[PDB]
Design a protein around this ligand. Sequence first.
Ligand SMILES: OC[C@H]1O[C@@H](O[C@H]2[C@H](O)[C@H](O)[C@H](O[C@H]3[C@H](O)[C@H](O)[C@H](O)O[C@@H]3CO)O[C@@H]2CO)[C@@H](O)[C@@H](O)[C@@H]1O
Length: 563
Amino acid sequence: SRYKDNRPLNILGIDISKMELGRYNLFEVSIFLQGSYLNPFDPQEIDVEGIFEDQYGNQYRVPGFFYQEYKRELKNDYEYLVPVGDPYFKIRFSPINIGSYKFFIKVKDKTGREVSSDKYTIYVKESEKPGYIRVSEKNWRYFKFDNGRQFLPIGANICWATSKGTYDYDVWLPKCAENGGNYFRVWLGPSWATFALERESVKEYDLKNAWKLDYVLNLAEKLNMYIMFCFDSYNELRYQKEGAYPYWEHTPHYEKNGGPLKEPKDFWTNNEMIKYYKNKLRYIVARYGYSTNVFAWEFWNQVDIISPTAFVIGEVKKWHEDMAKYLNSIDPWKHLITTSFAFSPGKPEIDSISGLNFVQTHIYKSNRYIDALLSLIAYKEKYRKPHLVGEFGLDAGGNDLWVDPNGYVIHNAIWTTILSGASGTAMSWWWDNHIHPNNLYFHYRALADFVKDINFLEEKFERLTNYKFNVYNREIKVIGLQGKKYILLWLYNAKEAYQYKKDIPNMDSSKFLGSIELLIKPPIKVIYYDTYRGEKIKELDLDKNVIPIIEFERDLAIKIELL
Ligand SMILES: OC[C@H]1O[C@@H](O[C@H]2[C@H](O)[C@H](O)[C@H](O[C@H]3[C@H](O)[C@H](O)[C@H](O)O[C@@H]3CO)O[C@@H]2CO)[C@@H](O)[C@@H](O)[C@@H]1O
């Protein structure tokens, strides 16, 4: 109990970040206090709350959180954080309406005594921010912002840094954002992760790693990027003898290391673990929930591959239902909630729970992965909620960077997924050893520039069907979407798309290859789009439903508009 206090409860100071701010922007209150509590991360010991009310009478109950300021530096090849001042408590709020808000601070400690502040008034003006990310009511395949504009996630996993810590995100994130990226995913466990909250304990959370997560979230805010926070990873509950980067023997949950659990199976039902997990969820909502740059709360990375001694489908299902309900109940902004599985088809008993707002796929497959992606996307339409291909790569023991230094595998997957009806791009692994050093960001820029000017929420897009190729020299295949105004096609050469040794196509391509007939009413306008340079190649007006295919090396995109 490093941070215990044993004084009579009193507020000693309140600092307010700003008295005027914009819609969806951060309003931060700092609270200095003394009190009686053993653990500032446990609301049964000390419960700080901010109670906000807009001019329409809507109320927001915002939990407060314990905070330590740090100043970062780089010591050669590792980040080092120097503490600045004593720790204290914070409230982080974000207004969804404009106008006036009234708020006050309340504190209760373990003695039952409660203290409170004076009522304060702040004023909120309109801003440019689009709001929080939600499921689209117009098309359940897709996400939207509160203002109604679509959110199509384009990006990659960026789940942890090297020892350089936040200094790596200073490099990766601007490159991603300047190349059309608006999405990444970070890990808050296991204990070795950059942002691990349960580093040494499951009862108290790591203030240094929480500060690093603040830093990265703030960088996302400046760059208009949106983050999935993955709370726990399967390694935590996987025994050494089971392989696959196991971590049970080292995890703070295990009794050997101070935690409540004798074996990982007990995670789902142990009363003490459940209590502390809810405290962690409260801490995460308190510290990060304000942010519209939090796209989603993800409970687990690949919960299906915890130890087989520990995976009890009915227990894991109930825990997800209960935790989703709890998290929603305490999150004033109701961020999206999800979970993930290593098994590519997922676990229907869990994926179908209403409390999980969207479903995911992880897939590492080397052969015919285009067809596998399409099949999984078609299959998961049964859930009638969005689908994110949250992890993707070859099944090559991590050798993607040697097999495919030009990123053709990523290229194929991002085009396939977007134009098959997934909510956004397939999300690559290997951000640090592949995407960045091989400078693969240009693939995302080309795709973003192709899709960004179409409102996917309103096109009534369906996976393409009723097509017929007429091509003699080659084997060309298509992944497509057909909507009420646009048809989007990705064509690929089946004999070239899965070979990765040749240099990036430098198109100079005038010849006719063949045609593809679609079930459309002319007249139409046809745009041919170079998927590597990210530019229009040619434009052609047509009076029939038969699209010439111009010459291309590997793959080519086509945008058709019903006129
Ligand atoms: O350096 C941090 C950490 O690395 C751990 O090992 C990583 C691997 O380096 C690799 O990225 C692996 O990726 C997995 C990941 O588990 C994902 O969810 C899915 O399973 O597929 C990808 C590709 O296989 O992830 C592990 C962690 O699970 C480990 O070496 C730690 O000691 C080290 O601190």
